[PDB]
Write a protein that binds this ligand. Structure first.
Ligand SMILES: Nc1ncnc2c1ncn2[C@@H]1O[C@H](COP(=O)(O)OP(=O)(O)O)[C@@H](O)[C@H]1O
Ligand SMILES: Nc1ncnc2c1ncn2[C@@H]1O[C@H](COP(=O)(O)OP(=O)(O)O)[C@@H](O)[C@H]1O
Ligand SMILES: Nc1ncnc2c1ncn2[C@@H]1O[C@H](COP(=O)(O)OP(=O)(O)O)[C@@H](O)[C@H]1O
Ligand SMILES: [Mg+2]
Ligand SMILES: [Mg+2]
Ligand SMILES: [Mg+2]
Lengths: 152, 394, 372, 7, 174, 401, 7
């Protein structure tokens, strides 16, 4: 059947103005000054001479995870994603094996971010990186990408 | 048990389930459906192992309903078939449940509000003549729902199988000019769930299959906080679709029939009922009250009965009330809603509060004589014994 | 035709007609029914809304909404359909040609008068208008200038004393207790016998029962024991489906609420004390003139026994010296309209109107100055 | 019920 | 609507087990009292046979219904043997031999309605049951043979042997 | 010029085609489709009367209980209905279709998903079958004396429905839906004959059961009294039906007996066929009306319109009008007793009319409708489909929200 | 009404 009374009260949503909503925490010390991240001149000067394996660690040493700002994160991603794309496919296992555990997890975070917005050939490389970091870090590396509340 | 050793019994005598027990009990002794079943022959069924009496009652009928033509004596709080209602009372007072002697016991009963008088007179006429109970009392379902909750002030919402009634109280002062009844309950839902399952091709026309759909309702059906969000889930996903296996082995599948059937408590036009739901009625009952009492009703909304046990009903009820408070009282001020104090007492023991309250009033008044109604009083006065309660009868 | 129009606009009914006439031309209930189902049969005059007697004919498939409640208008969109149904369909006249005389109960919110006058001009383009008190018109039809009127309708009940055309507003009293509050009370006590009426359509049936079988008891407690002993008052009523009911005690318990509102929970005093307490607020000099010229009005005063119970109770309060005489003409259900045709037919009244230009310069607030 | 509704 | 039940039950009618030891008009010998009327529990069950085998729901109102259900189940045993007969004299000889056969009774296996039938408690009541049924099993068969056989050919009718596959609900005394 | 609308009442047994404005349909064909037993081979099919006779093709019946089950065939059944029989360019003509009340929404969605996307129609209205059957009766009724209020019983091949109509508005929440219809009557006669009358070839049992049903069958006042009339006096009640074999072309004859009244009896004793249903139709109608509002109970008893092909049985309304008047005159008697016997209430005037057009009643109410201009407002439109999607046609009056 | 009583 049909009703013939004002039923407009059921349209407004009161749940928006709620006090029990979840609130995640952030690093107070980073809001004032953000981590500078891998400086381009550092990595780039190591890329000019072809020292990829050291420009590699220079990009994973600094990472603006604690930063609330998104541009420095984006600049940081473009730096490391610029680095991974220039590697030699035979040299990747040489580089991945050098990293400690906590660098493999940070690597796989950046890998699953490169798949978001790919260039012509940005993804055929990252799938090779994904194969090696998985051979070292296993599925538990990916789970620390899913559970990570703080993006790279 | 009173001072004289006479057991004090509390029988709810509901429309879909009987709740019988003794005073001071924190649970009920037996909870069984109020149906009577006579034997029947059907070609599909073949059984010759279990003896089938000529009159099966309660749990031994609903379990064997496949071989029976069950029939509910009570409908919407009113008693239709007395000869089938006495066969239920006997089972309730017999060796299968509460093997008591009626002549040496006290009984406490309940009637819903704004019911006919001949339904109350004829019960008391039966307890003193047929069973000859020593002491009788006929309580109000609302007042008992407060004793169990430990209160003196609260608007009650008691929804069962046939009746859905609302009774406000303020410091123990009844306000019967505010009592309201919606004509919707667990039986009007169980019919609507059959009319919906009929679209899928499942037919439950028989009298036994009515119980089978009740079990399908008690298990799966629920209430939607925001009915729009639930409709997206049924259109976009298929996770609401569950499965129920019937006694005959046939399996069925139930989806958006889970929140559409009990929505008829809030959108009652879906079952051809003109009016407003349990929320817009509870808000209008309060807005009829004296303006000073309204503040303490919102704080003490009390649910009861087994039709309030749909998952999501109190949350849905809190929501619809605050939408109406915002719209009609506050005129759209969201900022003032934070100060609106509302608490809906939804204890999970709300399935039996009319009984528990009867255990509480009995244990408090078991050993008093001005409270009960005696066999001697009924022999002398007759049905006019009810004037002790204030019920004007002649 | 330059005859003025008159419209009562009570809570339950709309009484309409022309000025100078003795009885109204159109009488229909003030309801607006909207359907509760989906009409799939096309080309069958299936309208979005029905009004008046066209709704009571189709009450089964409709939700009847009384736009007025206790004298106040709650839905102005529906009320335009009422007036539009009055002029164009019932009276079959344009409103811009003639003027109109409206009515209203005392102690209503000013926003109700402001809206009516706004609607007659901006919507209907009437040339002028006027707004009178309902009780005052009842005395014009009664042929008096001295007397206290007690108009009891469907939603409102109010007393108004006048003395030689001089109204005493300090003594006016209102009581939101009338037939619609009695109809609802009747539906609550009828459950005792086993008869359930919930639907709005079923509310109109119970109205027909109330105005056919309910009488007032000269002594409530005496007739209470009559019904308990015998079965003389047990009258019957035939529902449209063919069912049959029987009501005894419930015939005089319904209107007794007027004399004992505690049944309805209301703390107020009965009409028998209200009209008395109003008189006690008047001057000591003019009380005797009002004890004699005590008039009744409104459809709610059409119960049998209402005049005798008022005369009995009033005598018990007032002194034995004063003679209590109740006036209850057999057309008191239309007295307020009859006076309206009288008042608009007068030469003195032709200046009390509120013309189009006066509303244009002062706006709708002029009604408070012009219309008392 | 007796009149109105079944019960 | 409901099927056709027995109208003959009266409180003066005796009870055997939970059945109705009702009067029967027969030359055979048994515990059944002799009837004077022109209608019995047998003539009824033969009137109502063709119609009651199509229904699928039967509500037991009284004990005479338990006597009607038995006959209505035994008539389906007569027709299985009668359709093979080429002469009425051959049928009366087959209807005798079948009634002598000791079918199951209330309480023992073989009986399809053991649940809704009450066995005999004492042995004397057992001996009365086995001799009441055998009085029905004989007058039923004797009365079918007047109906089944078309006198034009003196052979079974297709209007009765079409109900051979139609059990009462689906039950059988075998 | 301006073109009329196409009207299609796809039923279980027979399908009713044509264009609006006309009084009787341009085609009435069975709802069959003959297929062979990849590429262009899905177009080697025939429908209607051109499907029964085809020897090397397999005849399929895609509609059951009013609902479609194989939309792979009904999409082929509709592209001959349009391009072969009607010869309509669907991008120009609007369309009116019919559904039963208990048609699922997903079947309404796949319907519109077919017409709007595949056939690219500019409009579509999916109406309720039996409701259109009531508008037809009003034309037989006097002009101006049209009774807007009426009850409808539409029983065909698949399913039977009881639909009240009050003042033009459909009381959808009180509709009933009985699954017994002309296919259950036919399979019950097809059963009784297999038991008695062997000699009917299995390929011609169905043809033989319809013939018995349409010609010889009828409705009885009492069942068991008819068995005696067929036994005691057999020459008068037992008919004979000579058929023709299709292989040898030799005749076969049978005796038509108890299946004359036993088929139609399942309207009143439906547990003969379907054990999942016991209530007669005489009682389903009383619950439909007593569940309706108290004010429109009398006018609905007074206009009970039988429609459909499976109400053409002789003495169908005479028994239905009698089983009700028993049921209605008692209820008024009981109330007169409980009240006190002071008022004798007015009796109810039950009336069961059986109007002249039944094989094309529903189509006729669709042609009168489509010939109006109001049809072209309520019709869902191609534009509305692209925006809102195939859920535009999801709702029916039987339910709310 | 707005405050007190409904209307
Ligand atoms: N888990 C559940 N969810 C929803 N409803 C339930 C559940 N369990 C029981 N019910 C309902 O509660 C009703 C019984 O309520 P109750 O008040 O105890 O009995 P009565 O209605 O006879 O007074 C039943 O009709 C049943 O449908
Ligand atoms: N004969 C009657 N007996 C009792 N009450 C009546 C009778 N006739 C009308 N009424 C009541 O009078 C009311 C209408 O009164 P009236 O003054 O004519 O219109 P309104 O109240 O809308 O101004 C109705 O609500 C109705 O219940
Ligand atoms: N004279 C008749 N008596 C009984 N049934 C008939 C008669 N004529 C036709 N029929 C039946 O009508 C049925 C079809 O009904 P109809 O509603 O026209 O089609 P559908 O059922 O497909 O909607 C067929 O099954 C046919 O046997
Ligand atoms: Mg309860
Ligand atoms: Mg008035
Ligand atoms: Mg059809």
């Amino acid at each position: 059947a049909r009703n013939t009374l004002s039923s407009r009260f059921r349209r407004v949503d009161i749940d928006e103005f709620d006090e029990n909503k979840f609130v995640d925490e952030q690093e107070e010390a980073a809001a004032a000054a953000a981590e500078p991240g891998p400086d381009p001149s550092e990595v780039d000067g190591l890329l000019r001479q072809g020292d990829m394996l050291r420009a590699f660690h220079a990009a994973l040493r600094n990472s603006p995870v604690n930063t609330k700002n998104q541009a420095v994160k984006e600049r940081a991603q473009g730096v490391v994603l610029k680095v991974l794309t220039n590697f030699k496919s035979s040299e990747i296992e040489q580089a991945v094996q050098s990293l400690d555990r906590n660098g493999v997890d940070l690597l796989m975070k950046y890998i699953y971010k490169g798949f978001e917005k790919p260039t012509e050939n940005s993804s055929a490389v990252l799938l090779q990186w994904h194969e090696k970091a998985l051979a070292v870090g296993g599925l538990g590396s990916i789970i620390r990408v899913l559970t990570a509340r703080k993006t790279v | 048990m009173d001072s004289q050793g006479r057991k004090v019994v509390v029988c709810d005598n509901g429309t879909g389930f009987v709740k019988c027990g003794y005073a001071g009990s924190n649970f009920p002794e037996h909870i069984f459906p109020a149906l009577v079943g006579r034997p029947i022959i059907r070609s599909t069924t073949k059984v010759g192992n279990i003896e089938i009496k000529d009159l099966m009652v309660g749990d031994e009928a609903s379990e064997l309903r496949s071989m029976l033509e069950v029939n509910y004596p009570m409908e919407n709080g009113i008693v239709r078939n007395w000869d089938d209602m006495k066969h239920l009372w006997d089972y309730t007072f017999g060796p299968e449940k509460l093997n008591i002697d009626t002549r040496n016991c006290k009984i406490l009963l309940t009637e819903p509000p704004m019911n006919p008088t001949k339904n109350r007179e004829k019960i008391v006429e039966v307890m003193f003549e047929t069973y000859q109970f020593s002491g009788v009392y006929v309580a109000i379902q609302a007042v008992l729902t407060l004793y169990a909750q430990g209160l003196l002030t609260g608007v009650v919402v008691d929804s069962g199988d046939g009746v859905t009634h609302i009774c406000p109280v303020y410091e123990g002062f009844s306000l019967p000019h505010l009592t309201r009844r919606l004509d919707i309950a667990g039986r009007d839902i169980t019919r609507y769930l059959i009319k919906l399952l009929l679209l899928r091709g499942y037919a439950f026309n028989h009298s036994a299959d009515f119980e089978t759909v009740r079990m399908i309702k008690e298990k799966l059906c629920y209430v939607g906080y925001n009915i729009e969000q639930e409709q997206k889930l049924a259109l976009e996903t298929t996770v609401l679709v569950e499965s129920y296996t019937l006694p005959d082995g046939r399996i069925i599948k139930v989806g958006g029939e889970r929140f559409e059937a009990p929505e008829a408590l809030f959108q009652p036009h879906l079952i051809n009922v003109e009016g407003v739901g349990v929320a817009e009625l509870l808000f209008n009952t309060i807005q009829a009250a004296d303006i000073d009492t309204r503040s303490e009703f919102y704080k003490h909304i009390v649910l009861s009965g087994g039709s309030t046990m749909y998952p999501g009903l109190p949350s849905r009820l809190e929501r619809e009330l605050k939408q109406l408070y915002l719209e009609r009282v506050l005129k759209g001020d969201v900022e003032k809603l934070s100060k609106f104090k509302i608490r809906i007492e939804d204890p999970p023991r709300r399935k039996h509060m009319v009984f528990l309250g009867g255990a509480v009033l009995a244990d408090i008044m078991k050993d008093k004589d001005n409270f009960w109604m005696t066999r001697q009083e009924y022999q002398e006065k007759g049905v006019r014994v009810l004037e002790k309660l204030g019920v004007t009868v002649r | 035709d330059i005859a003025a129009l008159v419209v009562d606009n009570g809570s339950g009914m709309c009484k309409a007609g022309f000025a100078g006439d003795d009885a109204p031309r159109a009488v229909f209930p003030s309801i607006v029914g909207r359907p509760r189902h989906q009409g799939v049969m096309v080309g069958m005059g299936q309208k979005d809304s029905y009004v008046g007697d066209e709704a009571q004919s189709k009450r089964g498939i409709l939700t009847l909404k009384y736009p007025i409640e206790h004298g106040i208008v709650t839905n102005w969109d529906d009320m335009e359909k009422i007036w539009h149904h009055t002029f164009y369909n019932e009276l079959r006249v344009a409103p811009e040609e003639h003027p109109v005389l409206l009515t209203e109960a005392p102690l209503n919110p000013k926003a109700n008068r402001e809206k009516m006058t706004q609607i007659m001009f901006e919507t209907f383009n009437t040339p002028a208008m006027y707004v009178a008190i309902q009780a005052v018109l009842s005395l014009y039809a009664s042929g008096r200038t001295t007397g206290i009127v007690m108009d009891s309708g469907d939603g409102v009940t109010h007393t108004v004393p006048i003395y030689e055309g001089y109204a005493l507003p300090h003594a006016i009293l209102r009581l939101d207790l009338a037939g619609r509050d009695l109809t609802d009370y009747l539906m609550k006590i009828l459950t005792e016998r086993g008869y359930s009426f919930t639907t709005t359509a079923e509310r109109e049936i119970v109205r027909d029962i109330k105005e056919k079988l309910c009488y007032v008891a000269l002594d409530f407690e005496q007739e209470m024991a009559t019904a308990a002993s015998s079965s003389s008052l047990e009258k019957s009523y035939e529902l449209p489906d063919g069912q049959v009911i029987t009501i005894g005690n419930e015939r005089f318990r319904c209107p007794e609420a007027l004399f004992q509102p505690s049944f309805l929970g209301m703390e107020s005093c009965g009409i028998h004390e209200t009209t008395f307490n109003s008189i006690m607020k008047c001057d000591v000099d003019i009380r005797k003139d009002l004890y004699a010229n005590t008039v009744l009005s409104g459809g709610t005063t059409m119960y049998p026994g209402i005049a005798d119970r008022m005369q009995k109770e009033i005598t018990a309060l007032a002194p034995s010296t004063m003679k209590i005489k109740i006036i209850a003409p057999p057309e008191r259900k239309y007295s307020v309209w009859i006076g309206g045709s009288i008042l608009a037919s007068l030469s003195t009244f032709q200046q009390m109107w509120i013309s189009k230009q006066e509303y244009d310069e002062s706006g709708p607030s002029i009604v408070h100055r012009k219309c008392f | 019920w007796x009149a109105x509704c079944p019960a | 609507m409901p099927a056709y039940h027995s109208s003959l039950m009266d409180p003066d009618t005796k009870l055997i087990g939970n059945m109705a030891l009702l009067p029967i008009r027969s030359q055979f010998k048994g515990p059944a009292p002799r009837e004077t009327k022109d209608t019995d529990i047998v003539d009824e069950a033969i009137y109502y046979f063709k119609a009651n085998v199509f229904f699928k729901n039967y509500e037991i109102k009284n004990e005479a219904d338990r006597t009607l259900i038995y006959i209505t189940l035994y008539i389906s045993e007569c027709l299985k043997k009668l359709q093979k007969c080429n002469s009425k004299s051959q049928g009366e000889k087959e209807m005798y031999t079948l009634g002598i056969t000791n079918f199951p009774i209330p309480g023992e296996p073989g009986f399809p309605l053991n649940a809704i039938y009450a066995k005999p408690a004492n042995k004397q009541e057992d001996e009365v049951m086995r001799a009441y049924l055998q009085q029905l099993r004989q007058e039923t068969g004797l009365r079918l043979c007047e109906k089944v056989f078309d006198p034009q050919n003196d052979k079974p009718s297709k209007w009765w042997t079409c109900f051979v596959k139609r059990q009462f609900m689906n039950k059988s005394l075998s | 010029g301006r073109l009329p609308a196409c009207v299609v009442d796809c039923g279980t047994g027979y399908t009713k085609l044509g264009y609006a404005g006309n009084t009787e349909p341009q085609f009435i064909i069975p709802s069959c489709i003959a297929i062979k037993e990849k590429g262009v081979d899905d177009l080697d099919f025939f429908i209607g009367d051109e499907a029964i006779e085809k020897p090397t093709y397999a005849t399929k019946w895609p509609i059951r209980h009013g609902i479609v089950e194989d939309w792979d065939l009904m999409e082929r059944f509709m592209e001959q209905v349009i391009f072969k029989y009607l010869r309509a360019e669907p991008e120009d003509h609007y369309f009116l279709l019919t559904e039963p009340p208990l048609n699922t929404p997903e079947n309404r969605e796949y319907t519109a998903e077919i017409m709007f996307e595949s056939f690219n129609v500019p409009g579509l209205y999916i109406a309720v079958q039996a409701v259109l059957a009531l508008a037809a009766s009003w034309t037989s009724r006097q002009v101006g004396e049209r009774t807007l209020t009426g009850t409808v019983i539409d029983s065909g091949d698949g399913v039977t429905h009881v639909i009240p109509v009050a003042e033009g508005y459909v009381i959808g929440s009180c509709i009933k839906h009985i699954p017994i219809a002309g296919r259950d009557i036919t399979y019950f006669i097809q059963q009784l004959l297999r038991d008695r009358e062997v000699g009917i070839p299995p390929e011609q049992s169905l043809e033989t059961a319809k013939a018995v049903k349409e010609r010889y069958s009828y409705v009885c006042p009492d069942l068991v009294k008819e068995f005696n009339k067929y036994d005691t006096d057999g020459s008068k009640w037992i008919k004979q039906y000579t058929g023709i074999n299709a292989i040898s072309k030799k005749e076969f004859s049978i005796d038509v007996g108890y299946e004359r009244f036993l088929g139609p009896e399942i309207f009143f004793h439906p547990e003969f066929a379907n054990p999942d249903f016991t209530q007669p139709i005489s009682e389903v109608v009383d619950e439909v009306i007593q569940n309706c509002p108290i004010d429109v109970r009398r006018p609905l008893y007074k206009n009970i319109v039988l429609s459909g092909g499976s109400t053409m049985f002789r003495d169908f309304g005479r028994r239905l009008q009698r089983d009700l008047k028993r049921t209605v005159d008692a209820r008024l008697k009981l109330s007169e007793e409980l009240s006190g016997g002071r008022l004798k209430p007015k009796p109810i005037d039950v009336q069961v009319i059986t109007h002249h057009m039944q094989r094309y009643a529903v189509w006729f109410g669709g042609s009168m409708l489509a010939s109006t201009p109001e049809f072209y407002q309520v019709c869902h439109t191609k534009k509305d489909y692209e925006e809102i999607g195939p859920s535009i046609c999801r709702h029916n009056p039987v339910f709310g929200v």
